[PDB]
mmCIF file of N, CA and C in Angstrom:
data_model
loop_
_atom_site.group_PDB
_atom_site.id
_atom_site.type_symbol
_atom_site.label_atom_id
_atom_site.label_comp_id
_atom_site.label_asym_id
_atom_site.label_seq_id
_atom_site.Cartn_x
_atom_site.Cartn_y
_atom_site.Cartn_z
ATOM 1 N N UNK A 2 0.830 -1.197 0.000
ATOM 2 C CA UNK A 2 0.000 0.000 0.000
ATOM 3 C C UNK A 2 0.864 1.246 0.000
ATOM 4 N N UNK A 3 1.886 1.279 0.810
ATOM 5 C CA UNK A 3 2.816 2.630 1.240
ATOM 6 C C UNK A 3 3.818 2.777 -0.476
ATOM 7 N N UNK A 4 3.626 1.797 -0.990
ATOM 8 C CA UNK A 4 4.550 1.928 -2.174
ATOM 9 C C UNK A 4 4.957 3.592 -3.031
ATOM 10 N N UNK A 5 3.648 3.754 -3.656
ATOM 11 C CA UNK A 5 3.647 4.847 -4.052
ATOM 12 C C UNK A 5 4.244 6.290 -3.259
ATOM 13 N N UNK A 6 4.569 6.380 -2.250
ATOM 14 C CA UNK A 6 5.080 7.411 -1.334
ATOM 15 C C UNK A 6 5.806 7.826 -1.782
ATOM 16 N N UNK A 7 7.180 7.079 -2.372
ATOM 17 C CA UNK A 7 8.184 7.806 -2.932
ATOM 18 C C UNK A 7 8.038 8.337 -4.007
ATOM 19 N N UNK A 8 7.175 7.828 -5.099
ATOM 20 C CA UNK A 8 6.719 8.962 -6.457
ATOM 21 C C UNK A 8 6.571 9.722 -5.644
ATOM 22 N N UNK A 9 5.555 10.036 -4.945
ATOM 23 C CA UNK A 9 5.195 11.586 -4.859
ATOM 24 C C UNK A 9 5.874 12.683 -3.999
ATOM 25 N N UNK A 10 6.853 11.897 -3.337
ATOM 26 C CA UNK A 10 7.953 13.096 -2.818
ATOM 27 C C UNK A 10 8.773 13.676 -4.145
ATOM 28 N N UNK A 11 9.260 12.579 -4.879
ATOM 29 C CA UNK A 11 9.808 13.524 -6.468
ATOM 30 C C UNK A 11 9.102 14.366 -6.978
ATOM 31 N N UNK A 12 7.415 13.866 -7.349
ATOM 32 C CA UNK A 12 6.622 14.331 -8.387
ATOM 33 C C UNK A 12 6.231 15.876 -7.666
ATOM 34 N N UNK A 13 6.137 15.842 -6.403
ATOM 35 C CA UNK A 13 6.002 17.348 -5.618
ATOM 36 C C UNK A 13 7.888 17.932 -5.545
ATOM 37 N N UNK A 14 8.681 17.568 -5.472
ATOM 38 C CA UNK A 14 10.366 17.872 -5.594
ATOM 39 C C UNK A 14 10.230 18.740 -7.078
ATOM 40 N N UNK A 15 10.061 18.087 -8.045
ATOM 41 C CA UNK A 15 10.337 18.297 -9.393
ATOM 42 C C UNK A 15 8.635 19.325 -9.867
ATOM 43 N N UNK A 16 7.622 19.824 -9.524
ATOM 44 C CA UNK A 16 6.812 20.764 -9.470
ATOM 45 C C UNK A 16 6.883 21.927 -9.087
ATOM 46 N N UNK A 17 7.772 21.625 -7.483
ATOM 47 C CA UNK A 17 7.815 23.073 -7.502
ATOM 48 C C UNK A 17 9.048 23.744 -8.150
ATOM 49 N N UNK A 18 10.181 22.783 -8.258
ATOM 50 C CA UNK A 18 11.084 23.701 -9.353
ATOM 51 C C UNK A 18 10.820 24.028 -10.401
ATOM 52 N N UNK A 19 9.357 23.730 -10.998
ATOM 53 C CA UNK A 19 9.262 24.578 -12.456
ATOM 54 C C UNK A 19 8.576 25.701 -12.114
ATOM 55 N N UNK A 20 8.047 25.664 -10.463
ATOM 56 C CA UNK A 20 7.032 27.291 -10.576
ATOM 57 C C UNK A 20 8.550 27.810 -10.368
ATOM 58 N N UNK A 21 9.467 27.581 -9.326
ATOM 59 C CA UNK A 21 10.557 28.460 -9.559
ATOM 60 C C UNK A 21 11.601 28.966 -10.750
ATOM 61 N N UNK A 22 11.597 28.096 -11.682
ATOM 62 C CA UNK A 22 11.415 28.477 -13.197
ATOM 63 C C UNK A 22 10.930 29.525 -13.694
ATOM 64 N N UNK A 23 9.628 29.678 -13.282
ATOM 65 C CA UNK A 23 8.393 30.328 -14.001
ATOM 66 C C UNK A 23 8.868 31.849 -13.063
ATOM 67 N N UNK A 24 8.795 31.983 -11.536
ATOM 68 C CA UNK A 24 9.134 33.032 -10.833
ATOM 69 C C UNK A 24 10.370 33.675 -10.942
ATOM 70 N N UNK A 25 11.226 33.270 -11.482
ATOM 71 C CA UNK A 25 12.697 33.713 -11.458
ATOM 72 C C UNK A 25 12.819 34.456 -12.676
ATOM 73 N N UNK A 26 13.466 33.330 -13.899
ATOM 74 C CA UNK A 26 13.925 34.035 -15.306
ATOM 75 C C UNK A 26 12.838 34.740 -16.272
ATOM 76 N N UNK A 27 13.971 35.763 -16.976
ATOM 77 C CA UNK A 27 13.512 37.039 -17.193
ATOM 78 C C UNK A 27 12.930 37.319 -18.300
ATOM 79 N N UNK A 28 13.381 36.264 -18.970
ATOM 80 C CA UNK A 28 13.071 36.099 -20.489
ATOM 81 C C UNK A 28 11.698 35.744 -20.670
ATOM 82 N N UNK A 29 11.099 36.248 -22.248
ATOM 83 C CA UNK A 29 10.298 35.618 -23.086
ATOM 84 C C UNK A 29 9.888 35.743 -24.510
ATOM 85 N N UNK A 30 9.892 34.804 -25.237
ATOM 86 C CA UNK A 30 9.630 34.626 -26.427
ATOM 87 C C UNK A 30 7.938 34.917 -26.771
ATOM 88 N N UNK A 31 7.318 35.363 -27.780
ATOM 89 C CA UNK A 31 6.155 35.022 -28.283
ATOM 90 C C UNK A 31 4.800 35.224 -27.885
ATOM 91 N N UNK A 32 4.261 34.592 -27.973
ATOM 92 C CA UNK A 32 2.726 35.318 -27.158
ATOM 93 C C UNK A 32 1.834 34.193 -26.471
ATOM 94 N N UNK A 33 1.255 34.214 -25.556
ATOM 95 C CA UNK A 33 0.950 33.396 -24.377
ATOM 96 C C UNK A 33 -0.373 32.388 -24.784
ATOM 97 N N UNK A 34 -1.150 32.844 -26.074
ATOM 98 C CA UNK A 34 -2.187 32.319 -26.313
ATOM 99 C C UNK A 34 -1.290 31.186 -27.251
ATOM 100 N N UNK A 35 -0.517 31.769 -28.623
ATOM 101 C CA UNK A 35 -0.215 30.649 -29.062
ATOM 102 C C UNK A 35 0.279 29.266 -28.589
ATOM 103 N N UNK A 36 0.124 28.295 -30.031
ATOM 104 C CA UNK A 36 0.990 26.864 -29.858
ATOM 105 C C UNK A 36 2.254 26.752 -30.407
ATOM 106 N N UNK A 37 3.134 25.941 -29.620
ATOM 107 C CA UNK A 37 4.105 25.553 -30.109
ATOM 108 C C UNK A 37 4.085 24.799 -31.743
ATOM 109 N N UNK A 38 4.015 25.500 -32.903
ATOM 110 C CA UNK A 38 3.514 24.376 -33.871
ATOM 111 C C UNK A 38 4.833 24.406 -34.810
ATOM 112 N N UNK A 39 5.350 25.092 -35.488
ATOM 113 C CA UNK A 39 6.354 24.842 -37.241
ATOM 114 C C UNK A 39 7.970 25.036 -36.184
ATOM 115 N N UNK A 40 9.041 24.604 -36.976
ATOM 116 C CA UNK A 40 10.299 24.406 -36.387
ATOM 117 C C UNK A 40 10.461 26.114 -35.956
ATOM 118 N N UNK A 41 10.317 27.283 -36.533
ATOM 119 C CA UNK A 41 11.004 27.778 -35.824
ATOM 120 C C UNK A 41 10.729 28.666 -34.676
ATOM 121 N N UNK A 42 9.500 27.733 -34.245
ATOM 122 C CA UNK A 42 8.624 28.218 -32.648
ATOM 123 C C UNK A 42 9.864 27.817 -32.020
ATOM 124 N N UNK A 43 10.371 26.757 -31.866
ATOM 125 C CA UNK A 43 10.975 26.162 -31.278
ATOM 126 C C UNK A 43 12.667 26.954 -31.173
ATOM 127 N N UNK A 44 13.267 27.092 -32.385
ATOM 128 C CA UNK A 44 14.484 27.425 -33.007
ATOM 129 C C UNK A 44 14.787 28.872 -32.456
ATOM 130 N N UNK A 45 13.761 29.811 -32.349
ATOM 131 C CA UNK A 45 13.979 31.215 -31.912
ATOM 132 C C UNK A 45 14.979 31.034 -30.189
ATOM 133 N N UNK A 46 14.734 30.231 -29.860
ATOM 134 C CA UNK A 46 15.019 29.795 -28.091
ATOM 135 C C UNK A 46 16.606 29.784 -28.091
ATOM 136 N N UNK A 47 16.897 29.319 -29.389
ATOM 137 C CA UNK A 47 18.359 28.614 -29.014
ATOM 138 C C UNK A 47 19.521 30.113 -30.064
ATOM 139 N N UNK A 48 18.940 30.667 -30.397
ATOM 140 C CA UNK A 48 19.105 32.127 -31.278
ATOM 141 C C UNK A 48 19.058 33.462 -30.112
ATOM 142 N N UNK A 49 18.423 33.481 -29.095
ATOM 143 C CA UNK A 49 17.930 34.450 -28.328
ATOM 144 C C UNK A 49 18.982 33.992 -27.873
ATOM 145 N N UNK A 50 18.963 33.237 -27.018
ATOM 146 C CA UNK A 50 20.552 33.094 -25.995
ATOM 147 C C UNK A 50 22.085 32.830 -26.722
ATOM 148 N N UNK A 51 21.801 32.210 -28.020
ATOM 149 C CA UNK A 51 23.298 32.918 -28.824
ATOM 150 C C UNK A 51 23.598 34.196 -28.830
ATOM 151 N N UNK A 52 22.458 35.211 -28.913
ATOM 152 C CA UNK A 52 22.552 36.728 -29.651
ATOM 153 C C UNK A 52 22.778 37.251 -27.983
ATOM 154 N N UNK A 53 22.518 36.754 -26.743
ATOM 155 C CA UNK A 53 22.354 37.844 -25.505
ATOM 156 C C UNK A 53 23.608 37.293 -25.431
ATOM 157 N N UNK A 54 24.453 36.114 -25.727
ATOM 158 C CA UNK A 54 25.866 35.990 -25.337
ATOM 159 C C UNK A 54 26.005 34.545 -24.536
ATOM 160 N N UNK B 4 -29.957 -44.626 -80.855
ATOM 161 C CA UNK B 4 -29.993 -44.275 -79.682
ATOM 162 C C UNK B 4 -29.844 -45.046 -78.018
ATOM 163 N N UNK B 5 -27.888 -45.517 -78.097
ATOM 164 C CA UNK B 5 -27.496 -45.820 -76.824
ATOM 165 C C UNK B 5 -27.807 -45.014 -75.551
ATOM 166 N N UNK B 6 -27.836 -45.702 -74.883
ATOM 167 C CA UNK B 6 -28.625 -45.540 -73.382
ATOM 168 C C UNK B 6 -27.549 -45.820 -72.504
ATOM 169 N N UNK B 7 -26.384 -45.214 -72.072
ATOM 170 C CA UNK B 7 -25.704 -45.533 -70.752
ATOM 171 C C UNK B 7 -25.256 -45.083 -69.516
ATOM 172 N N UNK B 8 -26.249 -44.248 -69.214
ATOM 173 C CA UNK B 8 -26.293 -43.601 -68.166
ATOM 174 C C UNK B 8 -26.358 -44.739 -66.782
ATOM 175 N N UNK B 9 -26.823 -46.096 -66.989
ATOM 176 C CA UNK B 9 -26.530 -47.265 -66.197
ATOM 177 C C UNK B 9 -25.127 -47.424 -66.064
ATOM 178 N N UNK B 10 -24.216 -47.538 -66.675
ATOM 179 C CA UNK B 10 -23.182 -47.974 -66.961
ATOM 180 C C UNK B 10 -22.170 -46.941 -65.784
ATOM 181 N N UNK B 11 -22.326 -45.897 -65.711
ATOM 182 C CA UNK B 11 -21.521 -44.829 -64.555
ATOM 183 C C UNK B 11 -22.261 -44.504 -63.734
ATOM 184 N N UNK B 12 -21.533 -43.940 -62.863
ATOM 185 C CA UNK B 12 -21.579 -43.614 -61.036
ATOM 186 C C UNK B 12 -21.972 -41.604 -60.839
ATOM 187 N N UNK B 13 -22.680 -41.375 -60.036
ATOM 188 C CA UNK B 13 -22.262 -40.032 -59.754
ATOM 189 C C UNK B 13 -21.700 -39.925 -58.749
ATOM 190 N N UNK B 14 -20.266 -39.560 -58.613
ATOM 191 C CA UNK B 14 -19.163 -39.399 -57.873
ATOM 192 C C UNK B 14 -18.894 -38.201 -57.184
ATOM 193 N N UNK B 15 -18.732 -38.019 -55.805
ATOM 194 C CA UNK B 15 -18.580 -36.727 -54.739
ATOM 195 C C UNK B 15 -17.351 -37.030 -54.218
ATOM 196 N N UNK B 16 -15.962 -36.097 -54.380
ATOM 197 C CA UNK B 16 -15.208 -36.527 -54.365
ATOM 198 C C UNK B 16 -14.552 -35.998 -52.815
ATOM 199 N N UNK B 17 -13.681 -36.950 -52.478
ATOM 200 C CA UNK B 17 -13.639 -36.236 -50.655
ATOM 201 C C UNK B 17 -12.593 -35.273 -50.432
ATOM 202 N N UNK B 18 -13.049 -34.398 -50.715
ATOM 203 C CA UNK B 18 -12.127 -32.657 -50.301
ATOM 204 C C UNK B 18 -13.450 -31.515 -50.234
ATOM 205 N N UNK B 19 -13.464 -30.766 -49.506
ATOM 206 C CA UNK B 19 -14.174 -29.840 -49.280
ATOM 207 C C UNK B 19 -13.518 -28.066 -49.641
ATOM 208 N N UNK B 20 -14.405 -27.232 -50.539
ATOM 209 C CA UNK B 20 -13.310 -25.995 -50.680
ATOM 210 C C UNK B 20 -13.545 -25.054 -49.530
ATOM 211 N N UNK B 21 -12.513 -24.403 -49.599
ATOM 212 C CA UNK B 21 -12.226 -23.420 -48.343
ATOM 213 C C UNK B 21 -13.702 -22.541 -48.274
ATOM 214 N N UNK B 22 -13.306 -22.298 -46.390
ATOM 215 C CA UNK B 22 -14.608 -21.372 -46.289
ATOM 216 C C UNK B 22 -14.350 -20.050 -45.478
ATOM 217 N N UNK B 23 -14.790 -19.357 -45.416
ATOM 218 C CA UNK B 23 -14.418 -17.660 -44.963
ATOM 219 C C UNK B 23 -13.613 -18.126 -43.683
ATOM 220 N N UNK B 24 -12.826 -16.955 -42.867
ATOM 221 C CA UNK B 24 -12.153 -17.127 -41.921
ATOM 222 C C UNK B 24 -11.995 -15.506 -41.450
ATOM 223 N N UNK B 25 -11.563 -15.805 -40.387
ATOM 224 C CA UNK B 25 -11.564 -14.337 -39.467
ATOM 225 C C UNK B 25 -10.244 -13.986 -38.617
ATOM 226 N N UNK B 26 -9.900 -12.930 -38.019
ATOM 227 C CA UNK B 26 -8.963 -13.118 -37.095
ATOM 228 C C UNK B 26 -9.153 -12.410 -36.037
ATOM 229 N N UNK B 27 -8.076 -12.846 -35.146
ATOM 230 C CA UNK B 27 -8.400 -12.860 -33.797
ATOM 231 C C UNK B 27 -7.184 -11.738 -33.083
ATOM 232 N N UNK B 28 -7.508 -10.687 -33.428
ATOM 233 C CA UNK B 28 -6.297 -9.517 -32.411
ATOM 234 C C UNK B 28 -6.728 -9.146 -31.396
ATOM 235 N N UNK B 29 -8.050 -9.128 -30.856
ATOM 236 C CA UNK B 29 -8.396 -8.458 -29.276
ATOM 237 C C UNK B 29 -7.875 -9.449 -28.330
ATOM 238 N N UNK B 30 -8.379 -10.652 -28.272
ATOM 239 C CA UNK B 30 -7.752 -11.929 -27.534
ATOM 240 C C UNK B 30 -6.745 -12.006 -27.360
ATOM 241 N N UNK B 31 -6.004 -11.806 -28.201
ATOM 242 C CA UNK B 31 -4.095 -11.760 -28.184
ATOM 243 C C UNK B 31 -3.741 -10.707 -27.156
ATOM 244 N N UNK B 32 -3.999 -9.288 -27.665
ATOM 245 C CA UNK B 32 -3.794 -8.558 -26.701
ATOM 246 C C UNK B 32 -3.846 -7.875 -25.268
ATOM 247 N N UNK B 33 -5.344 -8.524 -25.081
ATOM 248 C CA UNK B 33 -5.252 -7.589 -23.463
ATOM 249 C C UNK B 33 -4.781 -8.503 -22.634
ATOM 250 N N UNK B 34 -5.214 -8.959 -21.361
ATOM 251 C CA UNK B 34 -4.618 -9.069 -20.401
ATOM 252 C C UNK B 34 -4.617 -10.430 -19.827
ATOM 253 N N UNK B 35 -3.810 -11.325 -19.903
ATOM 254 C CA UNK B 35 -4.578 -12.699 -19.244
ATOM 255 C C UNK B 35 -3.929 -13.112 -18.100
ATOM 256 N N UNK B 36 -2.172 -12.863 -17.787
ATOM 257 C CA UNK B 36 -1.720 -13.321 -16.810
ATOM 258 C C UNK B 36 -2.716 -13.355 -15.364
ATOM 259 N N UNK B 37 -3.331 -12.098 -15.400
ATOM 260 C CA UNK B 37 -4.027 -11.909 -13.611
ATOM 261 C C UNK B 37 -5.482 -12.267 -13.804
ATOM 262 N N UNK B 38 -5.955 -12.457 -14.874
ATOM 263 C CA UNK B 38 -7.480 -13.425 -14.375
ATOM 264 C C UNK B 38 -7.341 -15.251 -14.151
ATOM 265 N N UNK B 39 -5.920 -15.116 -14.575
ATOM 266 C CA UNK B 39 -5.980 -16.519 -14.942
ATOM 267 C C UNK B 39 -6.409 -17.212 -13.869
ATOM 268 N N UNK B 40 -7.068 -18.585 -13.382
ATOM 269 C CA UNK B 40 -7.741 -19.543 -12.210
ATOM 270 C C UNK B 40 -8.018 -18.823 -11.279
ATOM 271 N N UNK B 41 -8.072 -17.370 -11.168
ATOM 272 C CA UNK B 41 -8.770 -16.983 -9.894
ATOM 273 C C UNK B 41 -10.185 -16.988 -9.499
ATOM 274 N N UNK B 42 -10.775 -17.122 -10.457
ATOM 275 C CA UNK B 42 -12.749 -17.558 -10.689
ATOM 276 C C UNK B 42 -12.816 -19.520 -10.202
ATOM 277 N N UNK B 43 -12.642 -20.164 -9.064
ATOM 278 C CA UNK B 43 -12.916 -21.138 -9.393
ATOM 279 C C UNK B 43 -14.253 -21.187 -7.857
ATOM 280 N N UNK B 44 -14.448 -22.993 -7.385
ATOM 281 C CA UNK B 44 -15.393 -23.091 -6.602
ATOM 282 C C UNK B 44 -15.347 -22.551 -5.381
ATOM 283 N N UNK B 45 -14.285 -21.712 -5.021
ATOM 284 C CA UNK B 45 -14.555 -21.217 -3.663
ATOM 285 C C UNK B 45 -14.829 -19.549 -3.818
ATOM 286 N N UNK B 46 -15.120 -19.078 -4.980
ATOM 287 C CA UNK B 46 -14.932 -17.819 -5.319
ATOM 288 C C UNK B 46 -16.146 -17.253 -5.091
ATOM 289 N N UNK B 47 -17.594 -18.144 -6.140
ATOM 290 C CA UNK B 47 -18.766 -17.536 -6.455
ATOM 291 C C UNK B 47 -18.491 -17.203 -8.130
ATOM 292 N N UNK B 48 -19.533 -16.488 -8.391
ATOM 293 C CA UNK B 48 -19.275 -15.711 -10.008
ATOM 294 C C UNK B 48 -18.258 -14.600 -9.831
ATOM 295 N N UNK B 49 -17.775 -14.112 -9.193
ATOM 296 C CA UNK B 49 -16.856 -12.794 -9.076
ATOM 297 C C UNK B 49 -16.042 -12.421 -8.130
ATOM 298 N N UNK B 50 -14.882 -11.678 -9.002
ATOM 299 C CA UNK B 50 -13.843 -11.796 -8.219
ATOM 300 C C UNK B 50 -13.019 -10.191 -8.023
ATOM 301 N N UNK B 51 -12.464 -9.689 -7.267
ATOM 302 C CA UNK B 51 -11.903 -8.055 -6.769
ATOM 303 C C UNK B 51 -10.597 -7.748 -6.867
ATOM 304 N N UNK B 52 -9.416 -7.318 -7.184
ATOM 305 C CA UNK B 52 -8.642 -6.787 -7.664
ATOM 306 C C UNK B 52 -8.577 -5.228 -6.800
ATOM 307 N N UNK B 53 -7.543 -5.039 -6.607
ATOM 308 C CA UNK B 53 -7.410 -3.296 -5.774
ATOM 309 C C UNK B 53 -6.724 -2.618 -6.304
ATOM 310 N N UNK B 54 -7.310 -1.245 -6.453
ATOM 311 C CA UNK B 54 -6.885 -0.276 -6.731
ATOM 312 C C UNK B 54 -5.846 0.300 -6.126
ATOM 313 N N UNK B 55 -4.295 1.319 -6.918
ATOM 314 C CA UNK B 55 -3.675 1.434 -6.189
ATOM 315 C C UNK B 55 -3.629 3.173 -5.376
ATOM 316 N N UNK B 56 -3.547 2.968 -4.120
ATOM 317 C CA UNK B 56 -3.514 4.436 -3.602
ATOM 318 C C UNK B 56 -2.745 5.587 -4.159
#
């Protein structure tokens, strides 16, 4: 029964480091309604942090 | 005007031709290891399995 215990100490470990993700860095790309859809939704990400250095 | 329709047999010969056929992919796939002999005379018609917390 107790099995599952340890998922959920990770699955709560690894949650809240993405709100701290979300609260911290400064950056953002694009607009909040769109989807991630054609390659260079994706491609702009790795261009932005070449060009800031 | 010979007459020998006495003279021969009407013959049915022993082979039968093929007949429609079907196949079987649901059976294959789902699940059989955990129902297997757990339905027998000390059971009743039905049997419980638990959910995990």
């Amino acid at each position: 029964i107790l099995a599952p215990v340890r998922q959920r100490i990770v699955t709560d470990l690894e949650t809240e480091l993405a709100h701290f993700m979300m609260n911290n860095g400064a950056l953002s790309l694009g607009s909040p309604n769109t989807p991630i859809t054609k390659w260079s939704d994706v491609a702009q990400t790795a261009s932005f942090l070449k060009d800031l250095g | 005007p010979n007459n020998l329709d006495s003279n021969v047999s009407q013959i049915v010969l022993k082979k039968f031709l093929p007949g429609f056929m079907s196949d079987l992919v649901l059976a294959k796939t789902v699940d059989r290891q955990l129902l297997a002999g757990e339905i027998n005379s000390s059971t009743g018609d039905s049997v419980s399995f638990k959910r995990p917390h």
